[PDB]
Design a protein around this ligand. Sequence first.
Ligand SMILES: COc1ccc(C[C@@H]2NC(=O)/C=C/C[C@@H]([C@H](C)[C@H]3O[C@@H]3c3ccccc3)OC(=O)[C@H](CC(C)C)OC(=O)C(C)(C)CNC2=O)cc1Cl
Ligand SMILES: Nc1nc2c(ncn2[C@@H]2O[C@H](COP(=O)(O)OP(=O)(O)OP(=O)(O)O)[C@@H](O)[C@H]2O)c(=O)[nH]1
Ligand SMILES: Nc1nc2c(ncn2[C@@H]2O[C@H](COP(=O)(O)OP(=O)(O)O)[C@@H](O)[C@H]2O)c(=O)[nH]1
Lengths: 425, 428
Amino acid sequence: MREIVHLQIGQCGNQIGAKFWEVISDEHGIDIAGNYCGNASLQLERINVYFNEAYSHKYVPRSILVDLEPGTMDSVRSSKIGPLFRPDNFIHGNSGAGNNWAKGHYTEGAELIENVMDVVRNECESCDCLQGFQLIHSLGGGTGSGMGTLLINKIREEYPDRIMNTFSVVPSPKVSDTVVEPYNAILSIHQLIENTDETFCIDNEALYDICFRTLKLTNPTYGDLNHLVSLTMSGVTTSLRFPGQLNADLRKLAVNMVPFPRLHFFMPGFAPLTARRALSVPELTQQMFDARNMMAACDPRRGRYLTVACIFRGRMSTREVDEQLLSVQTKNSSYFVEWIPNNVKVAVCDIPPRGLKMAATFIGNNTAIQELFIRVSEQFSAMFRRKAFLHWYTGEGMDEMEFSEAEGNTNDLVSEYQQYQDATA
Amino acid sequence: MRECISIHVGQAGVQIGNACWELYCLEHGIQPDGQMPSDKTIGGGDDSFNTFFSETGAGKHVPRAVFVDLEPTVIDEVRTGYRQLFHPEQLITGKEDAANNYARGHYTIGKEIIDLVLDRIRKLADQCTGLQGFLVFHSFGGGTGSGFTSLLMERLSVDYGKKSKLEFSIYPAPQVSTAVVEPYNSILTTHTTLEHSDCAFMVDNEAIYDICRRNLRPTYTNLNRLIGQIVSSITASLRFDGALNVDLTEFQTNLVPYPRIHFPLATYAPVISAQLSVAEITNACFEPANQMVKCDPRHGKYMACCLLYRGDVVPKDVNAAIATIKTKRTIQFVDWCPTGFKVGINYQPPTVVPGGDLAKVQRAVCMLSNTTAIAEAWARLDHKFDLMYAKRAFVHWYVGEGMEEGEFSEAREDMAALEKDYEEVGVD
Ligand SMILES: COc1ccc(C[C@@H]2NC(=O)/C=C/C[C@@H]([C@H](C)[C@H]3O[C@@H]3c3ccccc3)OC(=O)[C@H](CC(C)C)OC(=O)C(C)(C)CNC2=O)cc1Cl
Ligand SMILES: Nc1nc2c(ncn2[C@@H]2O[C@H](COP(=O)(O)OP(=O)(O)OP(=O)(O)O)[C@@H](O)[C@H]2O)c(=O)[nH]1
Ligand SMILES: Nc1nc2c(ncn2[C@@H]2O[C@H](COP(=O)(O)OP(=O)(O)O)[C@@H](O)[C@H]2O)c(=O)[nH]1
């Protein structure tokens, strides 16, 4: 099997990665000592993408936890999966950037990028073959977004023939009190347009909306958001973790879902979302394409699905799933582009996530993601027309033309998204 | 005195080839370990299966098969679940898949492995003294099965220009498709392997799925077993006693008039759940819903017909079935000596998998017929190609691996010329 090296940058990336790894190790039947204890041979199949095989039946993950504060590493080690992770792969700085993108992109990310490059090269030179790099980080923070984009640039320089999959978390004002987050988000969006081939746009605004409306929980606690994003990430990666008709092993997913090198912003979603219940096929399918259910602040009625990869998990009849999805596609033919035929790919995995009898995960390159890049850019416009906190970033050697370049690139992306939405077959 | 070297490219090619060689060992009575109970008393070749099976010094009947794929999972599946039957030297694996990209299998990933496959092909051909050609097993939708097939066809046309090469392609279907760019791969591998292929039995999985649904969703195992049965009864005449179509030149001359029009159509009557008269099973071979290509032959004109009967079928009533077929006004032949149904009958009954998907039957029939009804399928494929090229969708995944932008326009011009030539054949 091929090998993926997992990279987590920032405390948001570290926390969501720890919850995601716990969900995977519960799903794959791996205990805290790294020994297999599951009851299905499919769980041990395709395990080399994520878990490195150590001595004496020890399946440790190939996770590179990167941060600039040791408190996040202490919180990772204090959890249940702390001894399960590789102790040699821990990289932590002394001083955090603290919502400073320039400090994590030009000084401290630059001063630790040689060490993380040495760790990445040590992991890569032991690879029989490299499949790609999976990155999970937040676009709003200081070392998260800046160090993620610097790692992306270094990986694209070193390995230009490898895929770059990013679980970029777009910041939102409803859960984050910091004001300078449109600067970091727009700068990282401009870097991810030019130096990345894949992006899973998980938005905290839609997560707060889901926890407020669906789960009826007023408080947007970070544990519930961690659990929801971990469940959606497990449902997304069930194609890579288990063999099937739709393998979608990174490059195949990019060939199927990405028609253009700039328009590679996905929209993951999870239909049976329940906090810490009859499940059937048509209710899951009608919950799959709902605006409220999706984890990005978008309106799918205003956009067109360029590609859809709906994956079902559990024990279900495949014929009924195919019939229901064909009925959905024919009933809503105005919601899909007519110049890309057969854009809906369905795969069924027999192993459900733990805690759920059935699961339904959807990935889509909808045109409705340009509403998110209009919202973040217009919050960036209200923070750049009055130059709020501009002395921090421009004092680190960043030119003020960099913000104009990022705004122009995001406006060009919005213009190209609208232009390709207006075209019809 | 004659040999054939089977070539399987892609996951579909490897799985179809493994199922087909399993059915060939089942039909000929060859043991799975490689020995033969009855025919190993001679210990030599030319026993009517020497065109496919080679005998080593230990008496093992190893097939003359090359399994090539850029993913080693299916190769290790063949090598584990067979192992002593297939030599590991002739089973070539690969490291990185082309991942539903023609240009990846044609310019970068397949080009680093084409020389080893050519050397293995020459090594297997050195044991053959009177070899006829190669059977290419591949699939149109994949990345390996299109790009590496096109580069292999180019290399075998440059190096083996005195030989004729068949083709066993899988036409993409919307029911089971793992990619969106299957029209792009299919059009590009049709344009590249137009001048290098002489008989292409392109069968779509939609027809096999519909047959499995209405006679037998069914998985890839049932589709693989039915397709292996179809291909085994297609190539039943080549491994048995000589009546007709026992050579690749016979296949190229009985059905293919043009250098470009080399797409036959197969049709199978006896699909029953695990009797029937000769007239109805001859009539069922003319049913458009039982064909291996989802198309209507009544809007086109036939060019040839090679009915191959299997089992204990009396040859007297075959001519009466032919007369009752020809009395109907559905079949409209071409008007330059169209001949008719060149029936050859093999008296050995076909063997089905014990407890598999098809029941054992006594009367079996296959209709290898050329027509102009494949032009509808090529029109569908070019319509899907034209819908994804007006806005230049998915273009960058091919140009980034060394291909050019003008190759798509060249393949579009080639497919327009193929459609125009099919229309010119279809118009008196
Ligand atoms: C328009 O009027 C306003 C309305 C609201 C507010 C809200 C008000 N200020 C901001 O968000 C400003 C962020 C700019 C960055 C600047 C750009 C960082 O590079 C600076 C840096 C920091 C540390 C080390 C090196 C460099 O500071 C932070 O991130 C600091 C980090 C420090 C305390 C550890 O953290 C916070 O700010 C808190 C303490 C967590 C919360 N702060 C707020 O709620 C402010 C104003 Cl002025
Ligand atoms: N009938 C049948 N078709 C198959 C089988 N396996 C793959 N296919 C066809 O393969 C097409 C997609 O190609 P891929 O999934 O990339 O497999 P491939 O053609 O071997 O190409 P590679 O994966 O690169 O080797 C689908 O449209 C299927 O019709 C099989 O076992 N049986
Ligand atoms: N969904 C989710 N988002 C988070 C979580 N923690 C932080 N974030 C987001 O991440 C951003 C802060 O980035 P952070 O990782 O703290 O950057 P750092 O301090 O430089 O390491 C904020 O805008 C939050 O919206 C979490 O547990 N869940």
